[PDB]
Amino acid sequence: HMLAKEDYYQILGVPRNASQKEIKKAYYQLAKKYHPDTNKDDPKAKEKFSQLAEAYEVLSDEVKRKQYDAYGS
Protein backbone atom coordinates (compact mmCIF):
# COMPACT_ATOMS: atom_id res chain seq x y z
CA HIS A 1 0.00 0.00 0.00
CA MET A 2 1.61 3.24 -1.27
CA LEU A 3 0.38 6.64 0.00
CA ALA A 4 -0.16 9.66 -2.29
CA LYS A 5 2.69 12.18 -2.60
CA GLU A 6 2.85 15.94 -3.14
CA ASP A 7 6.16 17.63 -3.99
CA TYR A 8 8.03 19.90 -1.56
CA TYR A 9 7.90 22.76 -4.05
CA GLN A 10 4.14 22.79 -4.01
CA ILE A 11 4.08 22.69 -0.23
CA LEU A 12 6.20 25.79 -0.19
CA GLY A 13 4.58 27.54 -3.20
CA VAL A 14 8.05 27.69 -4.75
CA PRO A 15 8.90 27.05 -8.43
CA ARG A 16 10.38 23.93 -9.98
CA ASN A 17 13.50 26.03 -10.71
CA ALA A 18 13.74 27.48 -7.17
CA SER A 19 17.03 28.46 -5.63
CA GLN A 20 17.54 27.64 -2.00
CA LYS A 21 17.33 31.33 -0.99
CA GLU A 22 13.82 31.37 -2.64
CA ILE A 23 12.92 28.40 -0.54
CA LYS A 24 14.11 30.19 2.58
CA LYS A 25 11.70 33.02 1.80
CA ALA A 26 8.62 30.86 1.32
CA TYR A 27 9.43 28.85 4.45
CA TYR A 28 8.95 31.89 6.75
CA GLN A 29 5.83 33.02 4.97
CA LEU A 30 4.06 29.69 5.10
CA ALA A 31 5.31 28.60 8.50
CA LYS A 32 3.20 31.43 9.96
CA LYS A 33 0.13 30.17 8.05
CA TYR A 34 0.32 26.75 9.51
CA HIS A 35 1.82 27.32 13.06
CA PRO A 36 -0.41 27.39 16.26
CA ASP A 37 -2.74 29.31 17.20
CA THR A 38 -4.15 28.46 13.66
CA ASN A 39 -3.79 24.83 14.20
CA LYS A 40 -6.62 24.55 16.62
CA ASP A 41 -9.11 25.38 13.85
CA ASP A 42 -7.77 23.08 11.17
CA PRO A 43 -6.60 19.55 11.89
CA LYS A 44 -5.03 19.86 8.42
CA ALA A 45 -2.73 22.83 9.31
CA LYS A 46 -0.37 20.74 11.49
CA GLU A 47 -0.03 18.19 8.61
CA LYS A 48 0.73 21.03 6.19
CA PHE A 49 3.35 22.58 8.57
CA SER A 50 4.92 19.12 8.89
CA GLN A 51 5.42 19.10 5.17
CA LEU A 52 6.75 22.63 5.24
CA ALA A 53 9.74 21.74 7.45
CA GLU A 54 10.44 18.49 5.54
CA ALA A 55 9.97 20.25 2.21
CA TYR A 56 12.12 23.25 3.12
CA GLU A 57 14.80 21.34 4.72
CA VAL A 58 15.42 19.09 1.64
CA LEU A 59 14.95 21.86 -0.93
CA SER A 60 17.23 24.12 1.07
CA ASP A 61 20.15 22.30 -0.46
CA GLU A 62 21.58 22.31 -3.91
CA VAL A 63 22.31 18.57 -3.30
CA LYS A 64 19.18 17.47 -1.47
CA ARG A 65 16.77 19.43 -3.64
CA LYS A 66 18.37 17.89 -6.72
CA GLN A 67 18.57 14.28 -5.45
CA TYR A 68 14.89 14.36 -4.41
CA ASP A 69 13.92 15.96 -7.76
CA ALA A 70 15.78 13.07 -9.48
CA TYR A 71 14.43 10.29 -7.30
CA GLY A 72 10.82 11.62 -7.33
CA SER A 73 10.80 11.49 -11.16
Curated annotation (Swiss-Prot):
Interacts with JAK2, HSPA9B and IFN-gammaR2 chain. Interacts with Ras GTPase-activating protein 1 (RASA1). Isoform 2 interacts with MUSK (via the cytoplasmic domain). Widely expressed with highest levels in heart, liver, lung and skeletal muscles. Also expressed in keratinocytes; expression level and distribution is altered in basal cell carcinomas. This is DnaJ homolog subfamily A member 3, mitochondrial. The modification N6-acetyllysine is found at residue 48. Residues 7-72 form the J domain. It comes from the Eukaryota. The lineage of its organism: Eukaryota, Metazoa, Chordata, Craniata, Vertebrata. Modulation of apoptosis, i.e. proapoptotic activity of isoform 1 and antiapoptotic activity of isoform 2, is J domain-dependent. It is found in: Mitochondrion matrix; Cytoplasm, Cytosol; Postsynaptic cell membrane. Tyrosine phosphorylated. Modulates apoptotic signal transduction or effector structures within the mitochondrial matrix. Affect cytochrome C release from the mitochondria and caspase 3 activation, but not caspase 8 activation. Isoform 1 increases apoptosis triggered by both TNF and the DNA-damaging agent mytomycin C; in sharp contrast, isoform 2 suppresses apoptosis. Can modulate IFN-gamma-mediated transcriptional activity. Isoform 2 may play a role in neuromuscular junction development as an effector of the MUSK signaling pathway.
